[PDB]
C-alpha cells in the first residue's frame, strides 16, 4: 500500500533493488501497451517525453 | 518562452519536473506546484522511510 503512493521513479528505484497494476495506474490516455507490460510502456513513453522536454528547455 | 513551455510542464510528474529543473536551473516561476520545496522536504521524508521499508 505504501508503494501505491510512490511516484514512477520512486517505484522504479525500489524495483531495481508483481506490480504492473501500479504501472497501469501511472499510464496518456489514448494509450495501450503494444506487446509489452504497463511498466515497459511507461519507461518508453517517459523517455520520449524526457528527450522532448530536453530539446525545448535548453533556453 | 516560459509562457509556451508552461502547459507542457503542467503534464509532467513531480520527479520529471524536478529533473527538467536540474537540467535547466533557470526554470522557476515553476512554483505553481514555500512552495515547490515543501514538496521536496515532504518527499524526502517519505523517501527516507521507504528506504527502511
Q: For chain A, which residues make up each domain, given as ranges?
A: 1-59
* Candidate from B5, B13, B23 with C-beta closest to A54: B23
Euclidean distance between CA atoms A28 and A57, whole angstroms: 22
Going from the C-alpha of B19 to that of each of A17, A28, A52, B46, B52, the distances in angstroms are 21, 20, 13, 18, 24
Closest CA to A12 of A53, A51, A48, A47: A47
Size of interface A-B (CB pairs under 8 A): 36
Contacts of residue B8 in chain A, CB cutoff 8 Å?
Answer: 53, 56
**Grid coordinates representing B2?**
516560459
Contact A13, A32 (CB under 8 A): no
Resolution (A): 2.5
Technique used by the depositors: X-ray
Amino acid at each position: 500500500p505504501v508503494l501505491e503512493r510512490c511516484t514512477p521513479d520512486q517505484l522504479y528505484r525500489i524495483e531495481e533493488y508483481e506490480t504492473d497494476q501500479l504501472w497501469k495506474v501511472h499510464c496518456k490516455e489514448e494509450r495501450p501497451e503494444e506487446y509489452e507490460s504497463w511498466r515497459e510502456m511507461y519507461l518508453r513513453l517517459q523517455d520520449a517525453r524526457e528527450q522532448r522536454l530536453r530539446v525545448l528547455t535548453k533556453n
